[PDB]
């Protein structure tokens, strides 16, 4: 919709329905459009705060709202709020991180702790990789847990789950027969009648 | 099957087979009180009572003795923030009476099973 503001809560949660009612007509946010190729910030990448309350402190990206050009760092640019407040109890005070725009942070050289600018460039194999503008070097994509939280390697086979080998098994035989014709032959159904002529129009 | 073409049938035509079916049905707890054999289903509006008998007997291996259906009108009275009526989708309710004396009842899913004397002065202070 033309009037929809992206915030910090993951879309579709109770918070995002409360913030953005259908009748909301808040002033649009103006965001410098950034090409998919241009963007170089990914979850798990260590970055340094160029300016702000925690300027000069390095942190780890834990969330990226590309709709707002936001990068959220753990334990930095952090203000305070009460979580779990109830009528009976005040709640628990916690420190909540605030979003940072990309230009307010920079990526870090993998070997040395410095805010080295990077450029996108291909490799011998052809895979796209970020390369530092100075001290040209390959910064690997940081492995991060998936948002759904499912861990592949530790996942254990259970009922209603196919085995890995069974899924990999291939039995398709290329043949000029439809599914409607393979099933009957396999299942042994026999039909000798044929449909009468139909005048399509 | 729904939203698909059924071949026109003329005298001497073959039997119609639907190998993969678009009709998906859900069993509901009765709103009213129903006989032990009777079972309620919510089914796609294009499904016929004949299809449900075939649908349950073959896919689910359930013996069916009778099927009765009705079309439920959804409300169109609620208006949204723009004052536009919202229509609740109309659905088809099917009543299936089991055979051979078989009995069924909906299972019960979800078996779930300070200092008055010192008022308002912070107690953190030791002084």
């Amino acid at each position: 919709s033309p009037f929809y503001r992206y915030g910090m809560s993951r879309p579709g949660s109770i918070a995002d329905k409360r913030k953005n009612p259908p009748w909301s007509r808040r002033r649009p946010v103006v965001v410098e459009p950034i090409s998919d190729e241009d963007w170089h910030l990914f979850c798990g990448d260590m970055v340094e705060i160029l300016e702000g309350k925690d300027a000069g402190k390095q942190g780890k990206v834990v969330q990226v709202v590309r709709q707002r050009n936001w990068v959220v760092l753990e334990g930095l640019n952090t203000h305070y709020r009460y979580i779990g407040r109830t009528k009976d109890h005040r709640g628990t005070m916690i420190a909540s991180e605030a979003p940072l725009l990309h230009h307010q942070v920079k990526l870090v050289d993998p070997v040395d702790r410095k805010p080295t600018e990077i450029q996108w460039r291909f490799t011998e194999a052809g895979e796209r990789v970020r390369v530092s503008t100075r001290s040209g070097r390959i910064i690997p994509k940081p492995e991060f847990p998936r948002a759904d939280g499912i861990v592949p390697e530790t996942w254990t086979d259970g009922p209603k789950d196919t085995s890995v080998e069974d899924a990999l098994e291939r039995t398709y035989v290329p043949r000029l027969k439809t599914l409607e014709e393979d099933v009957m032959e396999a299942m042994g159904i026999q039909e000798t009648r044929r449909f009468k002529k139909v005048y399509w129009y | 099957a729904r939203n698909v073409l059924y071949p026109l049938y003329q005298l001497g035509g073959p039997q119609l087979r639907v190998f993969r079916t678009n009709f998906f049905i859900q069993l509901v707890r009765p709103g009213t009180a129903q006989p032990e054999d009777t079972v309620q289903f919510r089914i796609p509006m294009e499904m016929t009572r004949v299809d449900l008998r075939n649908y349950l007997e073959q896919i689910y291996n359930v013996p069916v003795a009778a099927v009765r259906t009705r079309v439920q009108h959804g409300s169109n009275r609620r208006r949204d923030h723009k004052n536009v009526r919202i229509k609740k989708p109309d659905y088809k309710v099917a009543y299936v009476q089991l055979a051979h004396g078989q009995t069924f009842t909906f299972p019960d899913l979800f078996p779930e099973k300070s200092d008055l004397r010192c008022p308002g002065i912070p107690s953190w202070f030791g002084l």
């Binding site: 009612p21 009748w23 909301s24 | 208006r79 923030h81 004052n83």
Partner: peptide, 15 residues
């Protein structure tokens, strides 16, 4: 005499 009226808009104010 003439006649014209206005609607009582639902006006949900919960922002």
């Amino acid at each position: 005499t003439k006649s014209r009226f206005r609607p009582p808009t639902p006006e949900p104010k919960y922002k």
